[PDB]
Amino acid sequence: PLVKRLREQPQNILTYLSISPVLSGDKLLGYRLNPGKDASLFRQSGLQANDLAIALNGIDLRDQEQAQQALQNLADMTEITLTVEREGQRHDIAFAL
Ligand SMILES: CCCCCC/C=C\CCCCCCCCCC(=O)O
């Protein structure tokens, strides 16, 4: 699963984020995000509680093979962008790694 795979990164991503896939029927809607033990990324121009992650570096997280590709690619990246849906609207947030 994607969460179990994010745990391999030297950045302690799961210290900053609590993540659950969101299912509807046979569809994955995205990944629901909330603060980890360190809530630093949650701020006005950053993430919000209950944001829905739908893309990583422009790759659709809802599509299983694409998401796999996006995750293998995060390994040697220096800055990554997350697209979230928040009360109907998309927002892009970048993170320095
Ligand atoms: C659903 C897929 C979610 C993947 C999201 C990854 C998002 C953010 C990574 C945040 C890393 C934050 C700390 C990076 C290491 C150094 C930064 C610091 O000084 O804390």
Resolution (A): 1.5
83 Cβ contact partners less than 8 Å away, ≥ 6 residues apart:
53, 54, 55, 56, 58, 90, 91, 92
Q: What residues does ligand 1 touch, defined as CB less than 6 Å away? A: 6, 11, 13, 16, 19, 31, 53, 56, 61, 82, 95, 97
Domain ranges of the chain: 1-97
Residue from 7, 11, 71 to probe ligand 1 pocket by mutation (most atoms less than 8 Å from CB): 11
Contact assessment for residue 55 and residue 69, using Cβ atoms and an 8 Å cutoff: no
Residue from 82, 85, 93 to probe ligand 1 pocket by mutation (most atoms less than 8 Å from CB): 82
**CA–CA separation, 92 vs 97, rounded Å?**
16
Only one residue has tokens 């944001």, namely 51
Resolved by:
X-ray
CATH architecture for the domain at 1-97: Roll (2.30)
